[model samples]
Target: GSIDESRIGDVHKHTGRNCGRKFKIGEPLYRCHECGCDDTCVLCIHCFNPKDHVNHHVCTDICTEFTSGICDCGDEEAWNSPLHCKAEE
Candidate 1:
């Protein structure tokens, strides 16, 4: 008697899948059910501050300078700030 080793003893338990949660840009910030915290710093990337002109602006300017004015898009705060980071646009 040759037994199929692969399917010899397989139990299929199909538990109903639950849909995962998603994040929104302008939506009221809320705690994540997964991480159990509202800390979404990663999304914003770098926290930009007007007083922090050097440290804040350094990320973008250095990146662009290295790559021949290429926008690195690596830093969100840098991407948000174009000139002096004065305007929130």
Candidate 2:
């Protein structure tokens, strides 16, 4: 029998099926500390800040841990908003 090794090292990327947002390398996800919607809310780097996530705490490691799809709490407006990284700006 012949051995076929073509698609090796291929990884099944999470297409953010539930969130509809594509997560890539280097892009960190942030979780809302005061997320009233869910007990634990994980959002992209864009949806973490005072404007939307006021008085909310955030952790980088926790964000990185969430490699799965994002959480949907019926608040797409805040989840799909823009990034508010003040340090970068």
Q: Best lDDT goes to which candidate?
A: 2
Clashes of each: 0, 1
Query: Residues 1-78, candidate 1, lDDT per residue (tens digit)?
Result: 877878524232112321122223332222122221222322111222334344331221222222222112223332
Tens digits of per-residue lDDT for model 2, 18-73: 34354565576666645533544455544334566665565553334446655342
Off by over 4 Å in 2: 1-19, 36-40, 62-66, 71-89
**Number of backbone clashes in candidate 1:** 0
| Per-candidate TM-score against the hidden true structure | 0.15, 0.40
Error at 12, model 2, angstroms? 24
List pairs with backbone clashes in candidate 2.
46-83
Q: Residue 11 lDDT in model 1?
A: 30
